[model samples]
Target: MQLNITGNNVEITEALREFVTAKFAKLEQYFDRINQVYVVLKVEKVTHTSDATLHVNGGEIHASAEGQDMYAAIDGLIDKLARQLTKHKDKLKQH
Candidate 1:
């Protein structure tokens, strides 16, 4: 699976790339068909905010948070995606 990353009005540095890759890689446990993960990271300087969008197997799931810390935003976004994955899995199990 490939992780596609993009930055809006900002540069995605190597450090950011490594951090995001490492973080999202942890989600592989959720489903074996993930296929790919796309990450969109943006900074809203006016609001001092950071947002992240995730795309899994061509489906999009997003979670965003604002803080002075970049790691916090990443953590929040990943947590949100994880929850979504769990919900989907539960729904499938109901059959």
Candidate 2:
């Protein structure tokens, strides 16, 4: 799957990019047909927000989280999306 990462109010650094890749790699286990993943990172005031949209074969999944740290927010957002993807994949496999 292709990954598109964008940032607002912040410039994406190599370390952050690598961190995103490493974190998202775990999601590959949930859905095999993920077409593309779009990640947006933004900082507002003292909070960091990370929103994600995943395009899959059947449908799309989205989630967003906010925290003082961007990585934490991103991790939380990914966890939320991962839960959604996991449930959908499980249901599909049952059919």
lDDT of each: 0.65, 0.81
- Kindly list the per-residue Cα lDDT of model 2 for residues 1-95, writing each as its tens digit: 78879989887889988888777787776567577888988987777888988887768877788767887888788788788888878867775
**Mind giving the per-residue lDDT tens digits that candidate 1 earns over 62-86?**
6666655566667777777677777
lDDT of 2 at 67: 66
Note the clash tally of each candidate: 0, 0
Candidate 1 has an lDDT of 0.65
Query: What TM-score goes with each of the models?
Result: 0.68, 0.88
List runs of model 1 lying over 4 Å from the truth. Answer: 48-63, 93-95
Using TM-score as the measure, the top candidate is 2
